[PDB]
Protein backbone atom coordinates (compact mmCIF):
# COMPACT_ATOMS: atom_id res chain seq x y z
CA UNK A 1 0.00 0.00 0.00
CA UNK A 2 0.84 3.77 -0.45
CA UNK A 3 0.30 6.93 1.12
CA UNK A 4 -0.54 9.26 -1.86
CA UNK A 5 -2.80 8.58 -5.22
CA UNK A 6 0.10 8.75 -7.61
CA UNK A 7 2.12 6.18 -5.57
CA UNK A 8 -0.87 4.13 -4.73
CA UNK A 9 -1.80 4.21 -8.74
CA UNK A 10 1.81 2.90 -9.68
CA UNK A 11 1.42 0.09 -7.69
CA UNK A 12 -0.92 -1.35 -10.77
CA UNK A 13 1.34 0.10 -13.05
CA UNK A 14 -1.13 2.91 -13.68
CA UNK A 15 -1.41 6.77 -13.04
CA UNK A 16 -3.58 9.21 -10.53
CA UNK A 17 -2.99 12.92 -12.17
CA UNK A 18 -3.97 16.32 -12.51
CA UNK A 19 -4.91 19.37 -13.71
CA UNK A 20 -2.17 21.88 -13.11
CA UNK A 21 -2.78 25.53 -13.80
CA UNK A 22 0.21 27.41 -14.43
CA UNK A 23 -0.67 30.84 -12.48
CA UNK A 24 -1.36 28.71 -9.18
CA UNK A 25 2.35 27.48 -9.57
CA UNK A 26 3.21 30.36 -6.74
CA UNK A 27 0.99 29.02 -4.74
CA UNK A 28 3.02 26.74 -2.30
CA UNK A 29 -0.07 24.85 -0.76
CA UNK A 30 -1.64 24.20 -4.65
CA UNK A 31 2.41 22.71 -5.12
CA UNK A 32 2.91 21.21 -2.23
CA UNK A 33 -0.84 18.68 -2.70
CA UNK A 34 -0.04 17.91 -6.28
CA UNK A 35 3.53 17.20 -6.04
CA UNK A 36 2.85 14.97 -3.49
CA UNK A 37 -0.22 13.41 -4.78
CA UNK A 38 -0.31 13.39 -8.73
CA UNK A 39 2.34 11.68 -10.95
CA UNK A 40 0.89 12.74 -14.38
CA UNK A 41 0.01 16.42 -15.60
CA UNK A 42 -2.04 17.92 -17.77
CA UNK A 43 -2.03 21.81 -18.91
CA UNK A 44 -5.28 22.85 -17.61
CA UNK A 45 -5.38 25.53 -20.51
CA UNK A 46 -1.63 26.59 -21.52
CA UNK A 47 -1.39 23.74 -24.25
CA UNK A 48 -4.50 25.02 -26.13
CA UNK A 49 -5.08 26.08 -29.58
CA UNK A 50 -5.50 29.62 -28.62
CA UNK A 51 -2.29 30.06 -26.22
CA UNK A 52 0.45 28.45 -28.35
CA UNK A 53 -0.71 29.43 -31.32
CA UNK A 54 -1.99 33.19 -30.29
CA UNK A 55 -1.74 34.33 -33.77
CA UNK A 56 -0.87 32.12 -37.24
CA UNK A 57 3.12 30.40 -36.84
CA UNK A 58 3.40 32.57 -33.80
CA UNK A 59 3.80 30.04 -31.32
CA UNK A 60 3.78 30.74 -27.42
CA UNK A 61 5.21 27.92 -24.81
CA UNK A 62 5.74 30.16 -21.92
CA UNK A 63 2.78 29.11 -19.98
CA UNK A 64 2.78 25.62 -21.45
CA UNK A 65 6.56 25.04 -20.67
CA UNK A 66 5.89 26.60 -16.94
CA UNK A 67 3.26 24.04 -16.50
CA UNK A 68 5.66 21.10 -18.39
CA UNK A 69 9.19 21.68 -16.81
CA UNK A 70 7.12 21.99 -13.30
CA UNK A 71 5.71 18.37 -14.11
CA UNK A 72 8.95 16.58 -14.64
CA UNK A 73 11.50 18.24 -12.24
CA UNK A 74 8.82 17.10 -9.57
CA UNK A 75 8.89 13.31 -11.60
CA UNK A 76 5.32 13.33 -13.34
CA UNK A 77 4.33 12.43 -16.78
CA UNK A 78 2.50 14.91 -18.85
CA UNK A 79 -0.62 14.80 -21.27
CA UNK A 80 -0.78 16.83 -24.06
CA UNK A 81 -4.03 18.52 -24.17
CA UNK A 82 -5.19 19.36 -26.85
CA UNK A 83 -4.56 19.97 -30.49
CA UNK A 84 -7.58 19.90 -32.66
CA UNK A 85 -10.79 21.20 -31.27
CA UNK A 86 -13.95 23.62 -31.84
CA UNK A 87 -13.42 25.15 -28.80
CA UNK A 88 -10.71 27.95 -27.45
CA UNK A 89 -9.90 28.29 -30.83
CA UNK A 90 -7.79 31.89 -31.70
CA UNK A 91 -9.77 34.27 -33.32
CA UNK A 92 -7.63 33.91 -36.51
CA UNK A 93 -8.52 29.94 -36.71
CA UNK A 94 -12.10 30.42 -35.99
CA UNK A 95 -11.99 32.93 -39.26
CA UNK A 96 -10.68 30.03 -41.57
CA UNK A 97 -12.60 27.34 -43.15
CA UNK A 98 -11.83 24.58 -46.12
CA UNK A 99 -8.47 24.13 -47.69
CA UNK A 100 -6.73 26.88 -45.69
CA UNK A 101 -8.24 25.39 -42.45
CA UNK A 102 -6.89 22.01 -43.07
CA UNK A 103 -3.35 23.37 -43.60
CA UNK A 104 -3.66 25.94 -40.35
CA UNK A 105 -4.55 22.33 -38.46
CA UNK A 106 -1.74 20.44 -39.86
CA UNK A 107 0.42 23.46 -39.10
CA UNK A 108 -0.98 23.95 -35.65
CA UNK A 109 -0.72 20.02 -34.64
CA UNK A 110 3.15 19.96 -35.94
CA UNK A 111 4.34 22.83 -34.52
CA UNK A 112 2.47 22.11 -31.22
CA UNK A 113 3.93 18.84 -31.81
CA UNK A 114 7.23 19.42 -32.37
CA UNK A 115 8.20 21.67 -28.96
CA UNK A 116 7.42 18.62 -27.25
CA UNK A 117 8.88 15.86 -29.50
CA UNK A 118 9.78 13.01 -27.30
CA UNK A 119 8.26 14.76 -24.19
CA UNK A 120 4.31 13.51 -24.17
CA UNK A 121 3.18 10.33 -23.24
CA UNK A 122 -0.10 10.95 -24.80
CA UNK A 123 -2.03 13.64 -26.47
CA UNK A 124 -5.52 14.47 -26.89
CA UNK A 125 -5.22 15.17 -30.83
CA UNK A 126 -8.69 15.51 -31.53
CA UNK A 127 -11.32 16.53 -28.69
CA UNK A 128 -15.44 16.69 -28.32
CA UNK A 129 -16.08 15.97 -32.20
CA UNK A 130 -19.34 14.56 -31.64
CA UNK A 131 -22.54 16.14 -31.37
CA UNK A 132 -24.27 16.27 -28.02
CA UNK A 133 -27.78 14.62 -28.09
CA UNK A 134 -28.56 11.26 -29.80
CA UNK A 135 -27.90 11.51 -33.39
CA UNK A 136 -24.35 9.96 -33.27
CA UNK A 137 -23.92 12.50 -35.71
CA UNK A 138 -20.20 14.95 -35.85
CA UNK A 139 -20.61 18.51 -34.31
CA UNK A 140 -20.74 21.21 -36.30
CA UNK A 141 -17.88 23.28 -36.49
CA UNK A 142 -15.40 25.07 -38.51
CA UNK A 143 -13.05 22.11 -38.75
CA UNK A 144 -15.82 19.37 -39.17
CA UNK A 145 -17.01 21.72 -42.18
CA UNK A 146 -13.43 21.58 -43.39
CA UNK A 147 -14.03 17.62 -44.00
CA UNK A 148 -15.39 14.85 -42.51
CA UNK A 149 -11.64 13.44 -42.69
CA UNK A 150 -10.20 16.11 -40.65
CA UNK A 151 -9.53 13.71 -37.44
CA UNK A 152 -8.07 11.13 -39.77
CA UNK A 153 -5.77 13.70 -41.37
CA UNK A 154 -5.30 14.98 -37.40
CA UNK A 155 -4.23 11.75 -36.48
CA UNK A 156 -2.00 10.99 -39.13
CA UNK A 157 -0.22 14.66 -38.73
CA UNK A 158 0.31 14.23 -35.93
CA UNK A 159 1.92 10.29 -35.92
CA UNK A 160 4.17 11.28 -38.23
CA UNK A 161 5.25 14.59 -36.05
CA UNK A 162 5.69 11.96 -32.92
CA UNK A 163 5.64 8.45 -33.16
CA UNK A 164 6.65 8.01 -29.56
CA UNK A 165 3.83 9.79 -27.85
CA UNK A 166 0.26 7.49 -27.73
CA UNK A 167 -2.75 9.30 -29.57
CA UNK A 168 -6.06 9.39 -28.18
CA UNK A 169 -9.74 10.90 -28.84
CA UNK A 170 -11.01 12.15 -25.99
CA UNK A 171 -14.88 13.07 -25.34
CA UNK A 172 -18.38 13.58 -22.82
CA UNK A 173 -21.45 12.15 -22.41
CA UNK A 174 -19.64 9.10 -23.75
CA UNK A 175 -19.57 7.25 -20.77
CA UNK A 176 -22.83 5.59 -20.47
CA UNK A 177 -23.00 2.69 -22.65
CA UNK A 178 -26.18 2.92 -23.51
CA UNK A 179 -25.80 6.48 -25.08
CA UNK A 180 -25.84 7.16 -28.90
CA UNK A 181 -22.88 9.51 -28.49
CA UNK A 182 -21.22 6.60 -26.97
CA UNK A 183 -21.51 4.30 -29.67
CA UNK A 184 -20.73 6.66 -32.31
CA UNK A 185 -17.41 7.27 -30.87
CA UNK A 186 -17.50 3.50 -30.63
CA UNK A 187 -18.24 3.05 -34.62
CA UNK A 188 -15.49 5.82 -35.49
CA UNK A 189 -12.43 4.21 -32.83
CA UNK A 190 -13.21 0.78 -34.79
CA UNK A 191 -13.40 2.01 -38.26
CA UNK A 192 -10.46 3.55 -37.16
CA UNK A 193 -8.30 0.64 -35.78
CA UNK A 194 -9.88 -1.20 -39.22
CA UNK A 195 -8.60 0.77 -41.26
CA UNK A 196 -5.03 1.44 -39.71
CA UNK A 197 -6.03 5.01 -38.42
CA UNK A 198 -3.21 5.48 -35.76
CA UNK A 199 -5.58 5.94 -33.07
CA UNK A 200 -3.31 4.88 -30.13
CA UNK A 201 -6.12 5.88 -27.09
CA UNK A 202 -9.93 6.95 -26.19
CA UNK A 203 -10.01 9.31 -23.11
CA UNK A 204 -13.29 9.58 -21.10
CA UNK A 205 -13.74 13.49 -20.15
CA UNK A 206 -16.28 11.85 -16.90
CA UNK A 207 -17.49 14.99 -15.79
CA UNK A 208 -20.00 13.32 -13.46
CA UNK A 209 -23.27 15.52 -12.78
CA UNK A 210 -26.83 15.31 -12.40
CA UNK A 211 -27.04 15.66 -15.87
CA UNK A 212 -24.84 12.82 -16.93
CA UNK A 213 -24.99 10.44 -13.67
CA UNK A 214 -21.96 7.80 -13.33
CA UNK A 215 -23.69 4.48 -14.56
CA UNK A 216 -22.20 1.36 -13.26
CA UNK A 217 -22.18 0.13 -17.32
CA UNK A 218 -18.99 2.61 -17.05
CA UNK A 219 -16.94 -0.36 -16.58
CA UNK A 220 -18.80 -1.95 -19.65
CA UNK A 221 -18.12 1.20 -22.06
CA UNK A 222 -14.44 0.67 -21.12
CA UNK A 223 -14.05 -2.96 -21.49
CA UNK A 224 -15.81 -2.32 -25.11
CA UNK A 225 -13.27 0.71 -26.02
CA UNK A 226 -10.37 -1.29 -24.73
CA UNK A 227 -10.95 -4.59 -27.06
CA UNK A 228 -10.94 -2.73 -30.02
CA UNK A 229 -7.05 -2.56 -29.59
CA UNK A 230 -6.63 1.08 -27.69
CA UNK A 231 -6.10 1.81 -24.34
CA UNK A 232 -8.31 3.74 -22.29
CA UNK A 233 -7.99 6.91 -20.04
CA UNK A 234 -9.97 8.88 -17.92
CA UNK A 235 -8.91 12.55 -18.43
CA UNK A 236 -10.82 15.31 -16.86
CA UNK A 237 -12.84 13.28 -14.15
CA UNK A 238 -14.54 15.47 -11.71
CA UNK A 239 -17.63 14.67 -9.94
CA UNK A 240 -20.30 16.85 -8.77
CA UNK A 241 -21.01 16.88 -4.78
CA UNK A 242 -17.56 15.18 -4.50
CA UNK A 243 -19.87 11.52 -3.65
CA UNK A 244 -16.85 9.21 -2.13
CA UNK A 245 -19.54 6.03 -3.31
CA UNK A 246 -19.01 7.25 -7.23
CA UNK A 247 -15.34 8.47 -6.55
CA UNK A 248 -14.44 4.83 -5.69
CA UNK A 249 -16.50 3.34 -8.73
CA UNK A 250 -14.94 5.12 -11.17
CA UNK A 251 -11.32 4.44 -9.47
CA UNK A 252 -12.61 0.41 -9.36
CA UNK A 253 -13.94 0.83 -13.25
CA UNK A 254 -10.55 1.51 -14.21
CA UNK A 255 -8.55 -1.06 -12.37
CA UNK A 256 -10.37 -3.71 -13.27
CA UNK A 257 -10.13 -2.98 -16.84
CA UNK A 258 -6.46 -4.09 -18.08
CA UNK A 259 -5.58 -1.02 -20.97
CA UNK A 260 -7.17 1.74 -18.28
CA UNK A 261 -4.02 3.49 -18.04
CA UNK A 262 -4.56 5.95 -15.27
CA UNK A 263 -6.92 8.35 -14.21
CA UNK A 264 -6.73 12.29 -14.10
CA UNK A 265 -8.85 14.76 -12.00
CA UNK A 266 -9.72 17.90 -13.62
CA UNK A 267 -7.50 19.91 -10.78
CA UNK A 268 -6.33 20.10 -7.29
CA UNK A 269 -8.99 22.15 -4.67
CA UNK A 270 -12.64 22.27 -5.30
CA UNK A 271 -11.71 26.08 -5.20
CA UNK A 272 -9.23 25.66 -8.31
CA UNK A 273 -11.75 23.77 -9.80
CA UNK A 274 -13.83 25.63 -13.18
CA UNK A 275 -17.17 24.02 -11.47
CA UNK A 276 -15.85 25.02 -7.72
CA UNK A 277 -19.69 25.60 -6.84
CA UNK A 278 -20.11 22.07 -7.60
CA UNK A 279 -17.60 21.12 -5.34
CA UNK A 280 -16.23 18.31 -7.60
CA UNK A 281 -12.75 17.44 -6.35
CA UNK A 282 -11.05 15.63 -3.71
CA UNK A 283 -9.52 18.53 -1.44
CA UNK A 284 -11.05 21.12 0.19
CA UNK A 285 -10.26 24.82 -0.28
CA UNK A 286 -8.07 24.59 2.44
CA UNK A 287 -6.45 21.50 1.19
CA UNK A 288 -7.70 19.38 3.69
CA UNK A 289 -8.54 15.49 2.01
CA UNK A 290 -12.07 15.07 1.45
CA UNK A 291 -14.16 11.50 2.31
CA UNK A 292 -13.40 11.40 -1.56
CA UNK A 293 -9.87 11.50 -1.78
CA UNK A 294 -9.95 8.86 0.98
CA UNK A 295 -12.10 6.30 -0.92
CA UNK A 296 -10.00 6.48 -4.23
CA UNK A 297 -6.33 6.25 -2.12
CA UNK A 298 -8.14 2.79 -0.28
CA UNK A 299 -9.45 1.81 -3.99
CA UNK A 300 -5.95 2.45 -5.08
CA UNK A 301 -4.49 0.37 -2.54
CA UNK A 302 -7.60 -2.79 -2.88
CA UNK A 303 -7.97 -1.86 0.89
CA UNK A 304 -7.06 0.63 4.23
CA UNK A 305 -4.84 -2.48 5.99
CA UNK A 306 -2.02 -1.20 8.50
CA UNK A 307 0.04 -3.73 9.42
CA UNK A 308 2.88 -5.91 8.20
CA UNK A 309 3.33 -7.20 4.39
C1 LIG B 1 -12.61 19.00 -20.57
O1 LIG B 1 -13.37 19.83 -19.71
C2 LIG B 1 -12.60 20.79 -18.99
C3 LIG B 1 -11.83 21.66 -20.02
O2 LIG B 1 -11.01 22.59 -19.31
C4 LIG B 1 -11.66 23.84 -19.09
O3 LIG B 1 -11.65 24.52 -20.35
C5 LIG B 1 -12.34 25.79 -20.25
C6 LIG B 1 -11.46 26.67 -19.33
O4 LIG B 1 -12.17 27.92 -19.08
C7 LIG B 1 -11.30 26.02 -17.95
O5 LIG B 1 -10.31 26.75 -17.17
C8 LIG B 1 -10.70 24.60 -18.16
O6 LIG B 1 -10.75 23.92 -16.88
C9 LIG B 1 -10.93 20.78 -20.90
O7 LIG B 1 -10.22 21.48 -21.89
C10 LIG B 1 -11.87 19.83 -21.60
F1 LIG B 1 -11.16 19.01 -22.50
Redesign the pocket.
Known amino acids: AESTLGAAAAQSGRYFGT?IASGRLSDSTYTSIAGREFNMVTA??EM?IDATEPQRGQFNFSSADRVYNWAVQNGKQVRG??LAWHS?QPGWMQSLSGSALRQAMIDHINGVMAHYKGKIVQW?VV??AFADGSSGARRDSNLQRSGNDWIEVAFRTARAADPSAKLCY?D?NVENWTWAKTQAMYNMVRDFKQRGVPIDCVGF?S?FNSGSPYNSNFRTTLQNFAALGVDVAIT?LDIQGAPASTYANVTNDCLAVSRCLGITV?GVRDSDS?RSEQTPLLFNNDGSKKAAYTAVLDALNGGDSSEPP
Open positions: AENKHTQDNENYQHEWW
